[PDB]
Amino acid sequence: ELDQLRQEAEQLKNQIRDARKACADATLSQITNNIDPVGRIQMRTRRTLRGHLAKIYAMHWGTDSRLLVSASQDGKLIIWDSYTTNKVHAIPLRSSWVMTCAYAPSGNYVACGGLDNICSIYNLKTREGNVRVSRELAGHTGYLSCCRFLDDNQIVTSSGDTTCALWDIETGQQTTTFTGHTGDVMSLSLAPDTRLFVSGACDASAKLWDVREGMCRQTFTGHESDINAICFFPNGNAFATGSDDATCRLFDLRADQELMTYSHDNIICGITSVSFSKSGRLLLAGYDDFNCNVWDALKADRAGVLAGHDNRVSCLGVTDDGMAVATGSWDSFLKIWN
Amino acid sequence: TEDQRNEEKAQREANKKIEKQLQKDKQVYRATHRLLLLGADNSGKSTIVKQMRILHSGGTSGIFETKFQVDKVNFHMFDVGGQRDERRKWIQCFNDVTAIIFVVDSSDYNRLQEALNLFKSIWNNRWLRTISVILFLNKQDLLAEKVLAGKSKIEDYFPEFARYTTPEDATPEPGEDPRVTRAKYFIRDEFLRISTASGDGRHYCYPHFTCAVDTENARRIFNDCRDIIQRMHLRQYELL
């Protein structure tokens, strides 16, 4: 019974690999010869936000490119204004450890999650004069590592118990469940069309789940180590991975295999968070040697290096306009690069 | 253009109030000390927090919280577990911890190997290399009653009990047989085997002995903490 299923799975994987080898006529490193180079991108820190006490773990840019959210391990969620460097709201959290924070596309809700296995949604209207807890949800057995807002009514959450969940803010119960992973689901990312989303875990693979049907479509298993961050391409047909393997990988939802690897022999530290720009030519990835490297998404060459942090950069965010990049590190610092 | 100036002054006043509240909370945050208790499921880690709570806030949701106050010192003890066995992904969060309370069980030598491996992996961690871990030897009365009744497995599972002596000279607890002292010191010397090769001057290991029921534990930690902040400060002014 066991051997007849194991050899069946083995020949299935061999057939899938033969298919990948059949559809692979060439690589992207052979067609990118007659392409103009970008050059040395010299970015400078314009503003410096100093309001965090403990280490900053994650952030999320807004849809208006005006306000951003940030979470630290002190127990507070800080909303920053990137223009005048002013804090408009400060919500004292009940727990001290938070691993993810998400800003709603409408600007009325904000979600936060951490080691308490509880996602706390706060409303930002503030009619009475102080912030209050709208509805907190607790239905996981692992740990909340990532959360994203699909709309003002639905939220996608990544748990550390091999289960991804889609919660509804009104009723507070799980609409669907995604059980396809075999390890702690690290992060997930939303497509601009909000129809399908890719999530990366510590299994050296990313899974492309659907929000309507409730199942996964493709599994890209070509990585080597625990994938940390996943970022869609601005078009919605491909994405990139960032992990501690010191190599950034690019996958596509239609190619179903690798596209191009970004590696270098003079670097040994891993990647913490990746984020594409508005165009997709430059890929910003925060490394583990206290810097953020911007790479060319078509040449696999170091386009630029920003060494402005003295601690490990924990989060990197690019707004929808691409005018500024916010890099938050473990030294309670948020650098605003141009 | 007057409305823009008015809203700007309003936002500036809001920023001033937010900074005032931030400083007010930073005061109590800097006046706060945290401690992280690590151990196995069968290890005697609940008997420490029970005696920390019965003599001197507490929440039971995922992680156990413990509060004990001795000599005007705050302590937030965190007993962390409700998750799966993989404790290597969320271990980067516990980076600013003052000291790691590591407790082990001496009643089971086969169950002590995984605790020794966890201690080795914690000492060899790149993020926990600047945090001194305090080693506690819990369940000593059971070890004493087990080694004397028989079942000699200390030299079978560990082939190092035939070539060993008693370097330290102190016998306050024993009054019947120094074999229990030899068995309690061999485990300490085995735990301090690889702990002195990785860390040279970054973090220190403090082995401490305790029983199943004790009352001077919260004190014993405090003195250890009293040293942990000292040497760190001694390393903050380039003096050693």
Epitope: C202, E224, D244 | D85, S121, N124, R126
Partner: nanobody, 126 residues
């Protein structure tokens, strides 16, 4: 693709000699640490031994210290495990596990949960 294939074993009388092979493919062998775990019938997992990147820092479990030998080959990308002076109580299911972090000496691969960085296992009964 991270995959580990174990070969060797079978019904062997105690007191003889045995050799197990661990074939690794899809990743760099000379930069990752490996180890061995065993599952006893009715008992949990237990570590056996480990090996450094170059192969100098080798540490065994006190149950079998001088009876087990492990050797890595980066040119062939393989691991060899020689076992002599077998004991009848050493029967277990063997797992040739690999450490997820490179350029280090710490590994968390002793738990019996859903782990995806090891082989299918070899049944060695005596």
């Amino acid at each position: 693709q991270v995959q580990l294939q174990e070969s060797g074993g079978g019904l062997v009388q105690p007191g003889g000699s045995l050799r197990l092979s661990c074939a690794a493919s899809g990743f760099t062998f000379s930069n990752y640490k490996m180890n061995w775990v065993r599952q006893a019938p009715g008992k949990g997992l237990e570590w056996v031994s480990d090996i450094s990147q170059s192969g100098a820092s080798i540490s065994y479990t006190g149950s079998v210290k001088g009876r087990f030998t492990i050797s890595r080959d980066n040119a062939k990308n393989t691991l060899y495990l020689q076992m002599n002076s077998l004991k009848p109580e050493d029967t277990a299911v063997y797992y040739c596990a690999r450490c997820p972090a490179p350029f280090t000496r710490d590994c968390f691969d002793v738990t019996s949960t859903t782990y995806a960085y090891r082989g299918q296992g070899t049944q060695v009964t005596v």
